[PDB]
Amino acid sequence: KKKDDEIQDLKRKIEEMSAEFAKMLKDTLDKMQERIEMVQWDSDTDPQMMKRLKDMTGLSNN
Amino acid sequence: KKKDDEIQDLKRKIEEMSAEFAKMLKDTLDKMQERIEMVQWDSDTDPQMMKRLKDMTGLSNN
Known part of the structure; x- marks a missing residue:
């Protein structure tokens, strides 16, 4: 036991x-x-690079 | 056993x-x-932001 x-x-x-x-x-x-999102937003980089990071991170909700 | x-x-x-x-x-x-380091280097921001991001996390080498 x-x-x-x-x-x-x-x-x-x-x-x-x-x-x-x-x-x-x-x-x-x-x-x-x-x-990552806050750094992206504070940086003047393009929403194109925004979407690039979003796709690369593999965080696209199903 | x-x-x-x-x-x-x-x-x-x-x-x-x-x-x-x-x-x-x-x-x-x-x-x-x-x-963080890559996104920081890609941006042309002054090394002021480099030092700020280094200091914020308190991860300074001990």
Whole structure:
């Protein structure tokens, strides 16, 4: 019973670490997008380059 | 003994996930730094913005 409980706890904490992995990955992607967009907007570069970055980043929502 | 083996496998998975998390977080940080530096160099803005972007994140080499 002790070892079963330990295995369950290990699985649960593996799931928790994976969840934090994914959540902070999404947060990092969001911050990357925000900084990139703000730099693009503050720069006088063309909306053509705006669309170029938008396409290259692969962020086109389906 | 089977339970001990399962526990050890779970611990190894935990360590592998932690290593992957740290490595790929470093990779994402490097990607963001490279993109910021490239977008900063392409623009003809005064190195004032270079220094401002360097100082804002507090990532000054320690």
